[PDB]
Amino acid sequence: ESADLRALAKHLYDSYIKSFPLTKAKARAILTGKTTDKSPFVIYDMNSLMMGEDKIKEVAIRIFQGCQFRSVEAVQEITEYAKSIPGFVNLDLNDQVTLLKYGVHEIIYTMLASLMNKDGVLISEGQGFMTREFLKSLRKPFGDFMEPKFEFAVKFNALELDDSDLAIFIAVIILSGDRPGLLNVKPIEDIQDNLLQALELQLKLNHPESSQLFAKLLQKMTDLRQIVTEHVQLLQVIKKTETDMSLHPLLQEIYKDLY
């Protein structure tokens, strides 16, 4: 049993490396300045935003549109990673779509934390760094969009997960049997139960001194759902007070009848 759970963990890590160009290991090196690559361009005010718009009409709207296109790319990367989880492509296609529709924003926020520190977030494949204070400086309601993600990220990053832990954590979230409208829950729960046993063993071996880390990650799964619920609400305000504000077609499809 345990040897097979390590082979599953390794498969997921290898698939995560294939699916996600900017890993946590690569992001932390950039953020702490321990890489040979050119330093990211720092965006901390409007003048620096203008200067760096090329290395990466109203400003808050332009930032929100770039957020959308990055989110679309992330949905596609997350979908390829999901298709690498053993058993996932043999699920009913309706259920694959439902798991991704309800799971991809929880995964986006998990993986965004890998690009964040308390002072800002890496953007454009690590070629830019936007400060948390600058995001706070945007006019309402856009100035509150990112702050809940930074708050989540600071506490999540304190758990010191690596990419090998994250690969299994993300798979567990995708294979959630309680999403609304799933047609065949038992095969999903069977895959998830095996992923949960792999995650427990991964954290016992990789974080032997981190007591109750598994329970803490289960609770982060709950927290991520609440984050996403709150995010969906903020978006419902954008469409009732902001014009020139239409979501990309892939995001429209995901958000339609979402929560």
Partner: peptide, 15 residues
């Protein structure tokens, strides 16, 4: 299928 019909783009990416 009803979900499939409402998610043309996610279906294309999954396929």
């Amino acid at each position: 299928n009803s979900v499939x019909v409402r998610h043309x783009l996610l279906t294309a990416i999954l396929x």
